[PDB]
A paper describes a structure:
O-acetyl serine sulfhydrylase (OASS), referred to as cysteine synthase (CS), synthesizes cysteine from O-acetyl serine (OAS) and sulfur in bacteria and plants. Our recent study showed that CS employs a novel competitive-allosteric mechanism to selectively recruit its substrate in the presence of natural inhibitor. Results show that CS uses a noncatalytic residue, M120, located 20 Å away from the reaction center, to discriminate in favor of substrate.
Mutation of M92 also affected the substrate recruitment although to a lower extent.
Author numbering:
A (entry chain X), B (entry chain X): 2 to 311
């Protein structure tokens, strides 16, 4: 029916079958670009704010502070705007000027730090701002805030189960904060009782989950797959539900993304191309030929036009 | 469940209540930016192609030719890509270079005409290309192709009826091709038996529907409300279901659009700001205080960032 504000309109994203990936239709994609803010992060921007209200840490008057690497800050921005919260978001001068303006036009009180050290400064500034008056601010902390995976367990997971009628066999998701694969896996494995195969995807340039699980020295490193590869293990990544970890390089993630536009008519971001390249690999293994593979496409295309993707 | 391709995933867009427009919640918006291609036009790109198949004019091998003023060409582009059709789209050198590239990355064989005369050349080229071999091409003709309003009568209309439980009293829609208000109005007035108020919206700069219905000389003229104000009466505009015509100027359409971002957390285009300004006007008339007003928001924000809107 009718949503009280734009925060409630999250989710119910479509599953679509791919024709030029997989084997006789075993790869189906879940299009999270089909959301407010054009990415999966709307789901956690909404729920981290709802939960902060449920527990009283968010009150009719307090101000949201956070630092953001991109999609999340827009999510929180639109939810704050929808629900009428002051929001401060911190980000260095290493930022897109189209990303600055979007945030600003969202009523974000944007904090511009120095580029140099990277995101460690703006994040430090984000705790710094809170440190001034903790009673005035609340930092939502997507990497460790459990409301992040709990929304995927409550929505994104059941949506997958429902739309496939319980027939999903594998789920393929890149990991940034890890909340996606976590919430979904728990949903399907624990609430819906089905021992699916949960596949984490990361960049071959910064393969810290793979290096970790194999006891190998952890060596994070630069990459272009925007949205994943945080370069450490996030607290919202539960390695206990991860069955398999696939790595994908940036160039293949791009080529796959472009390929989805030109052949599938699906316009998604570099991270969505990374996830499909991972799922395609598995789908074309005789052990997965009969199984139903569900791949999360984290974001939509038109918010990557001016980096590499175009 | 699972869509065979991205064309089938159109529609089921949300209704959201506005908090800073209308009077005690009588204005609710339908967010058509929440679609593949990020606009309502995905609905006609999909259906004009489906219907052309139903009637045999589109065959496994023919090529789509059309000229486009923007959103429609992306819609057709993604549907052609999804359904595996060659598409030629014509457009002058008066085009966004980010709009060119999106189309190109969609596998569009783009035709670049001369700017000078405007869109009359690229359209003429679009018939010109067909004129070479009509057996090779098919021109879908959104302004007069009835599959355009029939999709809104089949989907967008019933979605409104269903989500409001039949309680919608007024529908507010800007008119470009007119298919939106047409299909929706017929749906609700004729199929669902309810004598709602259908309100067309146009720019005060090019008020040809208003000048027409009042017998006044028709004087189209330049405007910035992208998506509406075609500067003539389209064949897919049935003035027989239009109860009222509101005009809105470009500056107010912008301000209203920005206002939806900053206060509602709804990121939409200039034409969506035009439609809400029209609906807000009516909503604050004592005669509409009790009635439920539904406003179509035709497109999403991130595809206007680089003109005026930002």
């Amino acid at each position: 029916a009718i949503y009280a504000d734009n925060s409630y309109s999250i989710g119910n994203t479509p599953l679509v079958r791919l024709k030029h990936f997989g084997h006789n239709g075993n790869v189906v994609v879940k299009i999270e670009g089909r959301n407010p803010s054009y990415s999966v992060k709307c789901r956690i921007g909404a729920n981290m704010v709802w939960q902060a209200e449920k527990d009283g840490t968010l009150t009719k008057g307090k101000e949201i502070v956070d630092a953001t690497s991109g999609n999340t800050g827009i999510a929180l921005a639109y939810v704050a705007a929808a629900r009428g919260y002051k929001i401060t978001l911190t980000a260095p001068e290493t930022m897109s000027l189209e990303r600055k303006r979007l945030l600003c036009g969202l009523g974000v009180n944007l904090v511009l730090t120095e580029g140099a050290k990277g995101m460690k400064g703006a994040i430090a500034k984000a705790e710094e701002i809170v440190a001034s008056d903790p009673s005035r601010y609340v930092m939502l902390k997507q990497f460790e805030n459990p409301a992040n995976p709990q929304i995927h367990r409550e929505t994104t997971g059941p949506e997958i189960w429902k739309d496939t009628d319980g027939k999903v066999d594998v789920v393929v998701a890149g990991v940034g904060t890890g909340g996606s694969i976590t919430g979904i896996s728990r949903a399907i494995k624990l609430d819906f009782g089905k021992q699916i195969t949960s596949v984490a995807v990361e960049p071959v340039e910064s393969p810290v989950i793979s290096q970790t699980l194999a006891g190998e020295e952890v060596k994070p490193g630069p990459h272009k797959i925007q949205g994943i590869g945080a370069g450490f293990i996030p607290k919202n990544l539960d390695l206990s539900i991860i069955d398999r970890v696939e790595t994908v390089d940036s160039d293949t993630a791009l080529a796959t993304a472009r390929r989805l536009m030109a052949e599938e008519g699906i316009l998604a971001g570099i991270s969505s191309g990374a996830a499909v390249a991972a799922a395609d690999r598995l789908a074309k293994l005789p052990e997965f030929a009969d199984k139903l593979i569900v791949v999360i496409l984290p974001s939509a295309s038109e918010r990557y036009l001016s980096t590499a993707l175009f």
